[PDB]
Design a protein around this ligand. Structure first.
Ligand SMILES: *[C@@H]1O[C@H](CO)[C@@H](O)[C@H](O)[C@H]1NC(C)=O
Lengths: 20, 48, 49, 86
């Protein structure tokens, strides 16, 4: 909660749930 | 087909296991359209 | 401690020339700059993972 | 409209798919621009309306494949595209 065309942003392989 | 597209992009006839990027999604244009407002206020040629 | 940043990818021809076919035809003869940039960005992405 | 149709609006030339727009120009406004400082909305000179101009080449593509030494079957992943728009 404390942290906020031709070009694409790829999602990470490991979601935040797996890191948790 | 996408396998042939991958071969074409990688410039090789054999592709190893993995994931590759080739191109994007594209619709070729058909016609050219030109638009301008109404042609009013014609010059007075008839009186000449 | 930071670990990984945002993984980004670029479509070289689409960014450079947009929707102009003649622009792409003129572009294809500058070589393999687009291939180099795609390769570098893919390397960065897999390194982040 | 709704196709890759080149357009030359009042001397402004571009290429893209024309779509109906929900943006509300001010009475004198003619051209619309996006965050990219590139033309994204236009006003038809003959009829006072607003048209969005999305791109013709939109939709990332990638080819998942095992080694061709093994098999020739492939799968296609379209990036950032809902499954009902292909
Ligand atoms: C241009 O003419 C058409 C019909 O010929 C009309 O519907 C339209 O309102 C006119 N444009 C303007 C700005 O008056």
């Amino acid at each position: 909660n404390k942290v906020t065309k031709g070009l694409t942003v790829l999602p990470p392989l490991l979601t935040d749930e797996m890191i948790a | 087909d996408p396998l042939s597209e991958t071969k074409c992009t990688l410039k090789s006839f054999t592709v190893e296991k993995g994931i590759y990027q080739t191109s994007n999604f594209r619709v070729q244009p058909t016609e050219s359209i030109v638009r301008f407002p109404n042609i009013t206020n014609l010059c007075p040629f008839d009186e000449v | 401690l930071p670990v990984s940043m945002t993984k980004t990818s670029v479509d070289c021809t689409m960014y450079i020339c947009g929707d102009s076919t003649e622009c792409s035809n003129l572009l294809l003869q500058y070589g393999s700059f687009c291939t180099q940039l795609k390769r570098a960005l893919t390397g960065i992405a897999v390194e982040q993972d | 409209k709704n196709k890759c149709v080149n357009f030359n609006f009042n001397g402004l030339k571009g290429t893209g798919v024309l779509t109906e727009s929900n943006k509300k120009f001010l009475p004198f406004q003619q051209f619309g621009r996006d965050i990219a400082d590139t033309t994204d909305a236009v006003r038809d000179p003959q009829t006072l309306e607003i048209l969005d101009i999305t791109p013709c080449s939109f939709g990332g593509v990638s080819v998942i494949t095992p080694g061709t030494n093994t098999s020739n079957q492939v799968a296609v992943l379209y990036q950032g595209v809902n499954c009902t728009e292909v």
